[PDB]
RNA sequence: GACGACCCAUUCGAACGUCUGCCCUAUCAACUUUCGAUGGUAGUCGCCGUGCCUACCAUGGUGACCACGGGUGACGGGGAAUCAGGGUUCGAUUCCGGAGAGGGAGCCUGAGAAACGGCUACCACAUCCAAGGAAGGCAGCAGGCGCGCAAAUUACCCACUCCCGACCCGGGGAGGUAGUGACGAAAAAUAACAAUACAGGACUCUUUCGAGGCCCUGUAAUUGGAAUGAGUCCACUUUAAAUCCUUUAACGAGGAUCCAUUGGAGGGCAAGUCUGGUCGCAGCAGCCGCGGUAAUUCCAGCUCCAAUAGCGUAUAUUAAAGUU
């Protein structure tokens, strides 16, 4: 149990690398503005966050 | 309060403050220079040495682990420093009797975390970073 | 030689309240980064500091007169302040948003020919506008009051007279 | 194209025997034309003929539409040929340089230094 | 007109002298004197004033208002970083003053030097030699070795700016120009617009359902029209000659590529009680703490968050510290 490389050398290695190109600079802020505030969805008090994979 | 507020007491103020400043811990290390003489560093951010031999270092309770450090002698002092090695499997990328580059933890004098007796870590083996060795965007140059 | 910074960073690294204001402000005007925001706010807070001196100086001190008179002229010349005001107290009533109205890309959209603000910035950079006789490529022109009645498209462009682009003449060939 | 030559702050510079102005030029759909073409037009605006005219400068602003330079016009040839920095005369040829690169001078100089009486070998001979 | 010379004045200075201003240390409190310490008298010397030096004579001078001694990774100042007010820290380094050219000493020339791109000697180095002798000092520009955590071309040129000479003409690694350059600073691209398609709010139309709808919105599907420099590149221009920049031919965008990364997602602190693997092992963790088979913190995948042509890490230091 002194052995190193243990946890990293017995884990599976997988990927699903992107084909889709993400935006930079201006447009990345444009989407951030619209998706949060100018949609306009919000409803009754909730905890949701901008992520939820629950 | 409880002290002079004269108009001609500049001497009694500026000589008192110059004495009671030495009771501060920080000030007393900076200006005596005993810091420099005692440290294995010259005040330099990094330093370079040559490996002596791998070791295993036990953890302080509650935590129990073996932490796989090294022990190193320096180029320019010849004295010995015990240095941590970062992420999993990076120990293997350090080979005995080669040069390394060391660096402090980020607490600037004191032992960090649950590992005692270690005050230094390792960043580059031989002009190549632990990152690129670990991630696999570079290979051993030998 | 001589160099200095034109912006400062916020003291707090994160703060839910702050970030939303900086985000939504950037959304309206099509700005690229917060560095384009903090730039404005440095200049403003500088002007707010100079004004804050002169109000505490004696009334009818010669220093206070000559500075204020020539200062307020400059604020009126760019059009962030009116001459129906014309005193130092209204400097402190000035705020961030009034500047941004006088930006080039804002004035293209507001008083000229554009779609959404995101379009208008691209037109400035792709050399399809001029300011009186002179091509520009800088959306941060900040535009003097007199020059608002000379904003026109360019005289060599496919927008108005001048040679077509390489999408049209390609398809012609 | 059709281009305009336009004056700007003339001086009758009697001491050097010349007339110096600015060469302010407008070009409509082009800009940045040869300097040779420019001095032709200035030849037939003061009738001084184009071999005593000399011009230089001519940086072109963004988007074209204007270019601005600096021009001299001498009364006679010999007043130019005397005064004139050499490279401006050689700019439209009548003079050259040689001489010859750089270095071959210094290495010869230090060799000439170490002889006395006769240095005619080193001046021709190495 | 040119040159030279004596003196006076002038200019550029040079040299001494006045008053005030200094970092740490008392586990440095008494210091200085015939090996002149302080003063008097006369003389020598020197460009001159003067214990500068010598003879004779006196016994003074300095200190708890910190002398004397020791230390300084101490050249000084004009300044720099941070900063409400008051401060703190740094100043090798482009301007000004000073000191020094391997370490010491002596000296020639000159108006000016105790000169080192002058000389002589000793000491420490190192080179050539026919062994008799001879020659040397990169803290000048480049360049090499060494030292280290740590730093560029043995490039081009007197055209600019100035200096030197008997000189309008000569010379200058001063200086200018280019190369290397993510120390650092300023500017601001990496897709904008319609069609269809779903989707939403005011609306308004309807009892509601539902439908329309333009101010919108993303989001799918393909596209369509339109635009531009990134690059490639003739010409002009630039300049000492050229590069770059600006200016202009001709090629140059359908998103699969003409590809944005660096860190983070338990709390402090903006963002996952998602999925797989590991099971106090391996590792993470500035700090508090995570891992003992159901891990929101480890190793990976997906998604999300922050800043962005930048971001992370180590160390010195300031603010936070009314914890000097």
UniProtKB/Swiss-Prot annotation, chain A:
Going by the entry's taxonomy, the superkingdom of the source organism is recorded as Eukaryota
N6-succinyllysine sites (modified residues):
46
Q: Where in the cell is it found?
A: Cytoplasm; Nucleus
The UniProt function text for this chain reads: Component of the 40S subunit of the ribosome. Contributes to the assembly and function of 40S ribosomal subunits.
Q: How does it assemble?
A: Component of the 40S subunit of the ribosome.
Q: What is this protein called?
A: Small ribosomal subunit protein eS30
Native species: Oryctolagus cuniculus
Swiss-Prot record, chain B:
Pfam families in alphabetical order: Ribosom_S12_S23
Matches recorded under SUPFAM superfamilies: Nucleic acid-binding proteins
Residues recorded with modification N6-acetyllysine: 135
Tell me the residues linked by Glycyl lysine isopeptide (Lys-Gly) (interchain with G-Cter in SUMO2): 37
Annotated signal peptide = none
Keywords of the record, alphabetical order, are: Acetylation, Cytoplasm, Endoplasmic reticulum, Hydroxylation, Isopeptide bond, Nucleus, Ribonucleoprotein, Ribosomal protein, Ubl conjugation
Q: Which CDD domains match?
A: Ribosomal_S23
Molecular functions per Gene Ontology: structural constituent of ribosome
GO CC terms of this entry: cytosolic ribosome; nucleolus; rough endoplasmic reticulum; small ribosomal subunit
Comp. bias regions, Basic residues? 1-20
**Gene3D superfamilies named among the record's database cross-references:** Nucleic acid-binding proteins
Membrane-crossing ranges are none
Q: Where is this region: Disordered?
A: 1-26
The PTM N6-succinyllysine maps to 54
Against NCBIfam families, the record matches this protein to: PRK04211.1, uS12_E_A
Which purpose does this protein serve, as stated in its record?
Answer: Component of the ribosome, a large ribonucleoprotein complex responsible for the synthesis of proteins in the cell. The small ribosomal subunit (SSU) binds messenger RNAs (mRNAs) and translates the encoded message by selecting cognate aminoacyl-transfer RNA (tRNA) molecules. The large subunit (LSU) contains the ribosomal catalytic site termed the peptidyl transferase center (PTC), which catalyzes the formation of peptide bonds, thereby polymerizing the amino acids delivered by tRNAs into a polypeptide chain.
- Name the chain's protein: Small ribosomal subunit protein uS12
Curated annotation (Swiss-Prot), chain C:
Positions of post-translational Phosphoserine modification: 147, 157
One Gene Ontology cellular component? nucleolus
GO terms under biological process: ribosomal small subunit biogenesis; translation
InterPro entries referenced in this protein's UniProt entry, alphabetically: Ribosomal_uS4, Ribosomal_uS4_CS, Ribosomal_uS4_euk/arc, Ribosomal_uS4_N, S4_RNA-bd, S4_RNA-bd_sf
Q: Which stretches make up the S4 RNA-binding domain? A: 102-173
- SMART domains this protein is in? Ribosomal_S4, S4
Q: Which NCBIfam families match?
A: PRK04051.1 (NF003139), uS4_arch (TIGR01018)
Q: What is this protein called?
A: Small ribosomal subunit protein uS4
From which source organism is this entry? Oryctolagus cuniculus
Question: Gene behind this chain?
Answer: RPS9
